[PDB]
A = this chain, B = another copy of it.
Amino acid sequence: SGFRKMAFPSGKVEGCMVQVTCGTTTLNGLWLDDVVYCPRHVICTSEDMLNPNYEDLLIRKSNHNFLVQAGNVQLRVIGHSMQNCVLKLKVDTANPKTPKYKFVRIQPGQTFSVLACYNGSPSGVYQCAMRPNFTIKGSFLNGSCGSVGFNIDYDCVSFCYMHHMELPTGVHAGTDLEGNFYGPFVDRQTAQAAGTDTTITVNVLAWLYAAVINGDRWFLNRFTTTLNDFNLVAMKYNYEPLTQDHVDILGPLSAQTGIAVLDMCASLKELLQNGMNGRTILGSALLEDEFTPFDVVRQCSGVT
Contacts and interface: CB of A to CB of B under 8 A. Distances in A.
User: Which A-B residue pairs are the 4 nearest by beta carbons?
Assistant: A11-B11, A285-B285, A121-B304, A6-B124
Interface in A2-21: 2-12, 14-15
A23 interface: no
A110 interface: no
Interface in A222-279: 275-276, 278
Nearest to A119: B304
A1 B170 CA distance: 6
A181 B239 CA distance: 45
A2 B139 contact: yes
Interface in A123-156: 123-126, 137-144
Task: Indicate the member of A123, A286, A299 with the most B CB atoms within 10 Å.
Answer: A123
Contacts of A172: 2
Nearest to A280: B286
B116 A6 contact: yes
Given A9-B122, A123-B302, 11 more contacts: A1-B166, A2-B172, A4-B137, A4-B138, A6-B125, A7-B124, A7-B126, A8-B124, A124-B299, A137-B283, A284-B286
Interface residues of A, number: 54
A89 interface: no
Contacts of A283: 137
A14 B304 CA distance: 12
A171 B2 CA distance: 7
A119 B302 CA distance: 10
A278 to B, nearest CB: 8
Contact of A304 (B117, B275, B284): B117
A126 B5 contact: yes
Given A137-B283, A284-B285, A304-B117, A11 B4 contact: no
A215 B167 CA distance: 13
A43 B12 CA distance: 33
A118 interface: yes
Interface of A: 1-12, 14-15, 115-119, 121-126, 137-144, 166, 170-172, 214-215, 275-276, 278, 280, 283-286, 298-304
Given A139-B3, A304-B123, A11 B8 contact: no
B2 A170 contact: yes
A8 B116 CA distance: 10
A167 to B, nearest CB: 10
Contacts of A275: 278
Contacts of A117: 304
28 contacts: A1-B140, A2-B137, A2-B140, A2-B170, A4-B126, A4-B137, A6-B116, A6-B126, A7-B125, A7-B126, A8-B124, A9-B10, A9-B115, A9-B123, A10-B125, A11-B12, A11-B122, A116-B302, A123-B298, A123-B304, A124-B299, A125-B125, A141-B302, A142-B302, A170-B214, A170-B215, A285-B285, A285-B286
